[PDB]
């Protein structure tokens, strides 16, 4: 590493080299945090986490008990040991608390003054973070499994919602219009994710073992349907062209948005060319998941790319483009529901059914 510093000082290597190499080295040295703790407030398992995209300081967490906790991750104390204190809380005494489990919570991109939370109580609530009051509510005829706002859209502010209905709802923040729907799936839509690269590209994964990419501006259904075999087993499109041999319960675009990682209940993760949906045939081995709802997993950013997938009661870290298994982060006592990656310091926060949020820091 002194070689890295010397090369940076002498201009031999771009500082990009040291930055990304050290980010990768930090991610590889991920371990149970020696001096860090997260305050425990959820009475039930944490189903979702979200660190705000700008300044990466505050973290939302939705629990199976319906409460939403807002933590400050910064060590505002002077000690080397600190607990990520809870700033705010939609608790059981809040007038607008979710009646059932919160399954997805997401900070509004471009601004930390608002966030959103969807629950199995058939509601997507939009909260003002300052007053901590519901600015808007979007009711659905069937329970919400996931939702996502575009991390890129300066123009549109649509929330793509996947419920147990076979339709992907698009709730417009502007002129409150939840009527827009996308047809083409056949069972519950367990995951939805906007492309970080393209403004109007949305990937949706449903229990019909299919993943569809939509240009929501378009009037002609999905753009691409992901196919495991790319055409080896080709059939008229009524039941073929499946992404997995089970329910596809997790989506994650890579950092650049040029590839898509789909995890399904066939104990398989697959990497897809996001421009034509071709399977890249990256192996990843066997990725154990049996979750009946959406599975939240994230990818690394700003490194020389990693994907952190909940794997039983562990976090499996894989190399996205080679599939090589890095490691198992092993500190949870029950199945891990979500993991969210802090890209500023290569940190990880994992929420599981054991009512714990565990922080993994580079050693």
């Amino acid at each position: 590493m002194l070689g890295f510093l010397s090369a940076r000082q002498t201009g031999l290597e771009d500082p990009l080299r040291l930055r990304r190499a050290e980010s990768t080295r930090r991610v590889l040295g991920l371990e149970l945090n020696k001096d860090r703790d997260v305050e425990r407030i959820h009475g039930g398992g944490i189903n979702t986490l979200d660190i705000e995209p700008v300044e990466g300081r505050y973290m939302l967490s939705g629990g199976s008990d319906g409460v939403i906790v807002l933590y400050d991750l910064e060590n505002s104390s002077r000690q080397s040991y600190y607990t990520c204190k809870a700033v705010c809380s939609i608790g059981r005494d809040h007038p607008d608390v979710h009646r059932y489990s919160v399954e997805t919570v997401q900070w509004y991109p471009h601004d930390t003054g608002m966030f959103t939370s969807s629950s199995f109580d058939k509601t997507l609530k939009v909260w003002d973070t300052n007053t901590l009051q519901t600015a808007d509510v979007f009711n659905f005829e069937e329970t919400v499994y996931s939702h996502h706002m575009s991390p890129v859209s300066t123009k549109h502010c649509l929330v793509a919602v996947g419920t147990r209905g076979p339709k992907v709802q698009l709730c417009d923040l502007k002129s409150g219009s939840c009527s827009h729907i996308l047809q083409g799936h056949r069972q519950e839509i367990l995951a939805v994710s906007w492309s970080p690269r393209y403004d109007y590209i949305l990937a949706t994964a449903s229990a019909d073992s299919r993943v569809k990419l939509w240009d929501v501006r378009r009037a002609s259904g999905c753009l691409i349907t992901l196919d495991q075999h790319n055409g080896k087993k080709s059939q008229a499109v009524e039941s073929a062209n499946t992404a997995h041999n089970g329910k596809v319960n997790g989506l994650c675009f890579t950092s650049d948005g040029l590839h898509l990682l789909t995890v399904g209940t066939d104990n398989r993760m697959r990497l897809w060319n996001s421009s034509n949906g071709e399977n890249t045939l990256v192996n990843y081995g066997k990725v154990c998941n049996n979750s009946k709802k959406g599975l939240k997993f994230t990818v690394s950013c700003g490194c020389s790319e990693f994907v952190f997938v909940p794997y039983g009661s562990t976090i499996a870290v894989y190399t996205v483009y080679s599939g090589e298994q890095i490691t198992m982060l092993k500190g949870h006592y029950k199945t891990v529901d979500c993991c969210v990656f802090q890209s500023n310091f290569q940190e990880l926060y994992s929420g599981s059914r054991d009512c714990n949020i565990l922080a993994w820091v580079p050693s």
Partner: protein, 64 residues
């Protein structure tokens, strides 16, 4: 009578199954969807209705 009840946590109808371990005098009610589990003592006169009852009571008491 009904043996499958709606879960107080996830509100999924008939998603809760009740197991009466009479040999240990314990009833275990588990939701298939959200995997919430609750254990209560039972008697020979007890039924899945009274296990489902003890669960609702424990929830309301713990939520005070």
């Amino acid at each position: 009578l009904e043996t499958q009840f709606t879960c107080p946590f996830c509100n999924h109808e008939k998603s809760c199954d009740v197991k009466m371990d009479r040999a240990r005098n314990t009833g275990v009610i588990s939701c298939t969807v959200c995997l919430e589990e609750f254990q209560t003592p039972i008697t020979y006169l007890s039924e899945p209705v009274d296990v489902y009852s003890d669960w609702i009571d424990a929830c309301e008491a713990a939520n005070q």
